[PDB]
């Protein structure tokens, strides 16, 4: 059933990955607005025209069905409105915004807020007015378990939680989660937002990831030391914060793979494109993206050691500002609503795709 | 106490009162940016160097201690990247920022959310973005009591729950997240002043809220009466809501009373260097702490101004919370803050009296 979606940081880690479902297991035609920011400003693991020829060419076994489908590339920030609104005229009429563009560094957020709530909010506020603009009606926004934080008992945080963010971050997420829902009495916008937990993982084809250089996140980081005990002979593995109120000491968090992100956003899609104005009272729903079982920092060096087969020694740290002690995802309404089936539980199975991509990229897309 | 200040949204009905205080009460240096948006494009009533020496020449008697006072305006928005740098350039250093931009009709905001988001939000961030490459670091906030919404009765504390009924509510709400953790990450020094409803004109009766295109009930009142001396019926929006009369309870505060609790604040923020910690981030509710319903509102005026102000009641405006009202101790307690004004009668009369003598506006 065709939708033409427009797919704001589109080029990144999670972006790439949803683009690559739609492609391979949807009709739709997809344009990616990325700055590259995100990317060190190159497009090489995008799958353009003109990219996907270039795999296509070099190397062949039997020619699989999703062989011509490719996405268009608007590179440029989505924060400037003219350049946006060319991009809606162009590749028009967009049926469908997937917001994924944002700073994401929670650590980050708390020195530099400004930094935050201008591309997070300002970012988000430009989207929502260009739908208006180009009458376009449905919108998928990448949220994040950062809206709930801390509790005023740390078990799976269902959709409706208490939300106090902890960090500048977690702020600028709810922000545009108020400002969807409020398009949706006013103007008639479909919105879903996701809230993500952590992800992880990458695609069975070990080709596209998360590469430890200039990551923040917990399992690019311990593989990319991992890839340092490889290299021809400070070293160890940073712990932040052993002194939080967790069974261990260690921030506990719930690592949800890219692939079934990837899936609830074609169940979302397909979920507000059936919405009519009869409804209207489902304009605007949430949903908490997780596994639901939890691993702590500790637990998670641990599935790395036994993943890579590597020593993998730590070293504990003051906390970073900005963390919370617990997230897990209580995922009940995504697998009623979308009818979302995760098809990774484990995190062994994750750690292997992740472990898998980054040990045959030394060097990253570079 | 001679620093120098910017006023943002400073031609406004609530700005043109807080500076008229500044220029009379204090030795602070007065530079206004506003877009002139709210004002119908005009600065008449703009106590500019022009201005203040024509209230010289068509004045009589012996010149007060302030009548040479008056503060530079600078036209344009604060969302223009250029323009404010230019601002802050020519007229700097500017030792504090004082934020009332913003767009304010509550229902409004509900039917289109991103004019207000746009607005209000990116105004604010504007605003911290150019304190922050200026070296400007105080900043006084214009927050609203649409910040709490209704409850999960009694005057509303400072650390009340808030959850916002509006767009509005919510976009105040934001820039004081905002400001706070601004606070924490470079040391801005910034007080967050939630207004109750704003009510009042001045004692010379020369400046205030006219009544045309007015989306608040005491100016679209005595609009009314205006309207038939200079349905014409006065619309209650609900009559349903759970508050003893069944209309919508509001704290009216005067201007002035708002304005020299700005004063105030500024002192606050000024007495303050490295050699301190975690008073860099404060709020402060400002009412009167007497709630007044809509059905008494009307009933003030009604006695105010001798005429009948014939009824009829509507439906809910959407956005309006039940009952909002200020508990003050904290500004009392910590600022000082003493509101002149106390009962909506007196309060309503400095209204009336600018209104009945400006048929026209300011035109
Ligand atoms: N990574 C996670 O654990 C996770 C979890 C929860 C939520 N999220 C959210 O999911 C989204 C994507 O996550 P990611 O891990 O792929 O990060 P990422 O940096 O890999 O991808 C985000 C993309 O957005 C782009 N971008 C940033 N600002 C832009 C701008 N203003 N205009 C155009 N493009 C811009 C970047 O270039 C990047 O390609 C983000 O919105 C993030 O907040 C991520
Ligand atoms: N009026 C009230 O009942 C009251 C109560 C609570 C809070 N507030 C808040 O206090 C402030 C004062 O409101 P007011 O009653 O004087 O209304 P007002 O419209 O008269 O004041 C706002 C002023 O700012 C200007 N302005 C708006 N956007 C601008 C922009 N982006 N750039 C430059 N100038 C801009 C307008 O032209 C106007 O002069 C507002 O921030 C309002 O949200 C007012
Ligand atoms: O060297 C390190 C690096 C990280 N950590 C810790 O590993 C855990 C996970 O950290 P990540 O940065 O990978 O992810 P977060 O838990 O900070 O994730 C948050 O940021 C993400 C976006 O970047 C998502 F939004 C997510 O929903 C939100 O919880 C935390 O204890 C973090 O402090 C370490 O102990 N040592
Ligand atoms: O024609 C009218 C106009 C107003 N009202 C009622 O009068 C009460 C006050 O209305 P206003 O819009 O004049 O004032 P608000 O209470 O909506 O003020 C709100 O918005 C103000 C700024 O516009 C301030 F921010 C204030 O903090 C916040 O309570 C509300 O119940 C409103 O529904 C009527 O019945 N008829």
Request: hydrophobic share 35%; net charge negative; charged share 25%.
């Amino acid at each position: 059933s065709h939708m033409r979606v427009l797919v704001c940081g589109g080029a990144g880690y999670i972006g790439s990955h949803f683009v690559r479902a739609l492609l391979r297991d949807t009709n739709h035609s997809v344009v990616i607005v990325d700055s590259l920011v995100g990317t060190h400003g190159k497009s090489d693991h995008v799958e353009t025209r003109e990219n996907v020829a270039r795999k296509l060419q070099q190397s062949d076994g039997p020619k699989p069905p999703w062989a011509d489908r490719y996405a268009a590339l608007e590179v440029g920030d989505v924060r400037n409105e003219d350049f946006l609104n060319g991009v809606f005229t162009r590749h028009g009429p967009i049926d469908a915004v997937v917001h994924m563009c944002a700073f994401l560094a929670v650590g980050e957020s708390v020195r530099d807020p400004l930094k935050y709530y201008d591309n997070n909010v300002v970012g988000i506020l430009r989207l929502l007015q260009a739908m208006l603009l180009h009458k376009c009606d449905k919108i998928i926004f990448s949220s994040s378990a950062a809206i709930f934080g801390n509790p005023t008992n740390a078990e799976p945080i269902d959709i409706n939680a208490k939300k106090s963010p902890e960090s500048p971050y977690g702020e600028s997420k709810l922000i545009a989660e108020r400002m969807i829902r409020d398009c949706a009495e006013a103007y008639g916008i479909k919105g879903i937002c996701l809230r993500y937990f952590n992800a992880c993982g990458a695609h069975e084809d070990g080709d596209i990831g998360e590469h430890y250089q200039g990551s923040t996140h917990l399992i690019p980081i311990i593989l990319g030391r991992v890839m340092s005990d490889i290299a021809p002979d400070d070293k160890r593995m940073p712990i932040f914060g052993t002194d939080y109120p967790t069974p261990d000491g260690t921030c506990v968090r719930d690592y949800v793979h890219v692939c079934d992100l990837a899936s609830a956003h074609i169940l979302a899609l397909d979920y507000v494109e059936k919405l009519g104005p009869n409804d209207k009272s489902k304009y605007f729903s949430v949903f908490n993206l997780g596994t639901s079982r939890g691993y702590s920092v500790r637990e998670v060096i641990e599935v790395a050691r036994k993943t890579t087969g590597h020593p993998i020694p730590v070293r504990e740290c003051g906390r970073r500002e900005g963390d919370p002690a617990y997230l897990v995802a209580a995922s009940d309404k995504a697998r009623e609503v979308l009818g979302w089936k995760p098809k990774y539980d484990t995190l062994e199975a994750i750690m292997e795709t992740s472990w898998k991509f980054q040990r045959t990229h030394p060097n990253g897309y570079a």
